[PDB]
Amino acid sequence: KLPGFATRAIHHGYDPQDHGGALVPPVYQTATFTFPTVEYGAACFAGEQAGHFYSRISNPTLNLLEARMASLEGGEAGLALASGMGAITSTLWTLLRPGDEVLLGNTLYGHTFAFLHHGIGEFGVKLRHVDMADLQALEAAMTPATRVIYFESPANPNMHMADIAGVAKIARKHGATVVVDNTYCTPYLQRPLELGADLVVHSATKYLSGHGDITAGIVVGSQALVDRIRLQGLKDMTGAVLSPHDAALLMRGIKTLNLRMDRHCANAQVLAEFLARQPQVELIHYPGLASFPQYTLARQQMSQPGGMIAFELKGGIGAGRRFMNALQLFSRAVSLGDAESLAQHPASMTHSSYTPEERAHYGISEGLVRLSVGLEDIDDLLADVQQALKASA
Amino acid sequence: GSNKLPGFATRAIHHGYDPQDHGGALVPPVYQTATFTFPTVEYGAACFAGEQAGHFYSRISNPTLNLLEARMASLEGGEAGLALASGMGAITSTLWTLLRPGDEVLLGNTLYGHTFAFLHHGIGEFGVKLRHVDMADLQALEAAMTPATRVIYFESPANPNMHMADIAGVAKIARKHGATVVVDNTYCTPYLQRPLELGADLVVHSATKYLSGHGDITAGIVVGSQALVDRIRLQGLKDMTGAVLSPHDAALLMRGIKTLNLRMDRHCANAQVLAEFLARQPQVELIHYPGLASFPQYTLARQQMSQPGGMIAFELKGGIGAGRRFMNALQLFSRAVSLGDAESLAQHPASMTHSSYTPEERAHYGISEGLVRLSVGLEDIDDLLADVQQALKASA
Known part of the structure; x- marks a missing residue:
């Protein structure tokens, strides 16, 4: 029926x-x-x-x-x-x-x-x-x-x-x-x-x-x-x-x-768990981490925590820049929800024109990078973020 | 150079x-x-x-x-x-x-x-x-x-x-x-x-x-x-x-x-022949085509446009009535609104787009009751003449 x-x-x-x-x-x-x-x-x-x-x-x-x-x-x-x-x-x-x-x-x-x-x-x-x-x-x-x-x-x-x-x-x-x-x-x-x-x-x-x-x-x-x-x-x-x-x-x-979203989420679940433990990383925003401020409401509205992750690097704009440039599997692009993984760092990309204070009133942190986790093999995605974190220091 | x-x-x-x-x-x-x-x-x-x-x-x-x-x-x-x-x-x-x-x-x-x-x-x-x-x-x-x-x-x-x-x-x-x-x-x-x-x-x-x-x-x-x-x-x-x-x-x-350039040459050459033929038909009361001297703005048209286009508007003797007959009788022109297609299009606003109204009305916007618009396409001109010839007769 x-x-x-x-x-x-x-x-x-x-x-x-x-x-x-x-x-x-x-x-x-x-x-x-x-x-x-x-x-x-x-x-x-x-x-x-x-x-x-x-x-x-x-x-x-x-x-x-x-x-x-x-x-x-x-x-x-x-x-x-x-x-x-x-x-x-x-x-x-x-x-x-x-x-x-x-x-x-x-x-x-x-x-x-x-x-x-x-x-x-x-x-x-x-x-x-x-x-x-x-x-x-x-x-x-x-x-x-x-x-x-x-x-x-x-x-x-x-x-x-x-x-x-x-x-x-x-x-x-x-x-x-x-x-x-x-x-x-x-x-x-x-x-x-x-x-x-x-x-x-x-x-x-x-x-x-x-x-x-x-x-x-x-x-x-x-x-x-x-x-x-x-x-x-x-x-x-x-x-x-x-x-x-x-x-x-x-x-x-x-x-x-349905198939693609299951995989976007499963890929983002591992990357978030990885990122949350990293020393270069002060803050992460991912609905499926226990630490997510609205964890409970998230679980009420969404059947899965999604394919997007945002996080903030210790080290501000320079760390972000270094991270973005070293990426080899993730592409530097705006947009999200493709089969290919994408990353952006607004302070040095979409919002580079303004300076440190104007990006604050919009809640855009100097070290904020956002990932659209795609459908590639996670081991490949993991390696790519890893060496990029190494490059950001 | x-x-x-x-x-x-x-x-x-x-x-x-x-x-x-x-x-x-x-x-x-x-x-x-x-x-x-x-x-x-x-x-x-x-x-x-x-x-x-x-x-x-x-x-x-x-x-x-x-x-x-x-x-x-x-x-x-x-x-x-x-x-x-x-x-x-x-x-x-x-x-x-x-x-x-x-x-x-x-x-x-x-x-x-x-x-x-x-x-x-x-x-x-x-x-x-x-x-x-x-x-x-x-x-x-x-x-x-x-x-x-x-x-x-x-x-x-x-x-x-x-x-x-x-x-x-x-x-x-x-x-x-x-x-x-x-x-x-x-x-x-x-x-x-x-x-x-x-x-x-x-x-x-x-x-x-x-x-x-x-x-x-x-x-x-x-x-x-x-x-x-x-x-x-x-x-x-x-x-x-x-x-x-x-x-x-x-x-x-x-x-x-x-x-x-090729299509437009043909739309215009076709519409020119259609328009001159329509100007001479018993059932056609009025016709607007910028390539005819009878077009109210003939002189402005020929000063601004290198050729007179592929659109014709014309009024039938009879009213709303005669449109329906003409339109429904067309076999090659399609009943449709739009223009500039390879295929020839006709619309009779009275019995189509503006049919929600009465004999009165549309005057507000200024539209006749036997008015038909043609978008002349790229079909053989003899087949297009033949289609409107047989459809005018039906509209009587």
Whole structure:
């Protein structure tokens, strides 16, 4: 009656028999759709059928992707966009208007922060940052203006978690809509809608695709809210249309999601256990260490601690630089959730422009490096981090 | 001499690419990669500071997109190009970038439906002031200018009546008062009309249409000055829109552009013959094609466009009624909305797009009850004449 996650990630919403027996669904790389009669055309520009009209909407390969993602997240409806920024700008452009306020997690993915403060925030929308695990600080931050609560969990830099059920309880008192960016965990590890959130966004560019070869975004949620985001945010405000080709490749990626995430976590579990014992290392942030400040809440929301690790080297910027340069298997790159392991050191990379004090107000430590642990053999990954730690001294 | 600009077809095929820089690959390899890596954290640092040239992350820059961009720039005669997920991606990333609350944008009298919706229900609801003016009436435009006027935005020819504006005249007014001129050049492509060479600051394209030519991708393009395109790339696209073009689709777009001059020659030659034939048919009350002397702006068309395009609009004798009959009788033209495909398209807004209404109405927007729009494609002209001939008879 109710098939497993792995079954649904492979099968949900598709029966080969409905499409000439094709085991893999054919790709609708088409811009436009045609009508058998003008009477048939007339029905599409109001709505009654659930058919197809124009690939900026109603494409069957996008439709399948959306249904499958909605199934996995446990939500009513899905929407596929050209990037994770597309998913979030479409969502927020449709939910907010001048004078509305959005409450934010204290830290956010860089471009998201840029969107809020330098984009929509410059159009009369109000922004407040608050710690989304501190339920009393949140209740006290609610105002009649508050219309959206938006955060990632876990969040860069320190993998800080939100209490999603608690946020939802507070939001429901004020009618506010809770949006969670679930990029890090994926629906395999965490399902925020089952915990009370109204909408989830994904940069499918990362773990969902898993292979570093597409940019894509996903939104899942209630049908009324998803419809408006499709018909307003996507169609009119953004034009962040997902290629059917990239959509097909994303679905191909999703068929191994459970497998890849088990391995991302198992690899990160050993590296974290290793890193936590090293002398070059003052601090580690990894949800599956007993020492993780929100260890308990982590275990309540996530079925596994994930593939990302953040840590701080004794020795600041110079140690970070030395560590990064010596790496031979990990690549120096931004991004995460690929088969290949990646590392970044923000103080010398993404945030090298500013100086020691400005990086502090953002919680970006001078020695902070972040690993996206991939799928390579751990012995190889271990050796690589080891010699790099040796080089950092 | 060698300071001579290569021809348009030469540039559409070769501009910005030399096989010898990629191991002799005749066709550029497709950079289907979300991210790029760094040799050191210094070379990586230098690429968030503006010292070194290179690649951050495919949402901001990518070699396949870059070549498409430089090539579209060359063709429009602009400094810099930007490739996006759709035409609306191009339009929204440009407008979100250039406009803030308190600013006014002056708009052509009619627009593409989603552009109109974007303006009125989107950015217009965020404190941006909108005013429509007839961009053909240079005196009215000049009179509408205020110190708040920040952008002037229009299509030429415009959806849906093929109304034209004097691009050079609009540019002259804009330079005296200080507004940025953005022109949607979808209908013409740079092969037929180059608004930037006429003084526009920016042009936008739905490359989904003629640039692609084969109706298999969605894409948008912006061309203009290096400074404006950089700003749009770094604010509109990257933060405000996320309308990222797939490198696969961008390769396909470049493949389309290699035949643009050839396809457009044929769209125009076909539409010219169709239009003259339709002008002479008993059932046709009215016809708009820029290649006919009866086109209200015949003279502006022939001054701005090297050829008159592949779109025809025409009214049938009879009403709503006669459209349905004509449309439903077509066997070769497809009933569809869109344009610039290899295949011929027809739409009868009365019984299709705008069917939610009544005989009254649409007048608000100014649309006839026997009005049909054709996107003339690349099929044999005799088969296209035969299809509309047999369908006109059915419409009686």
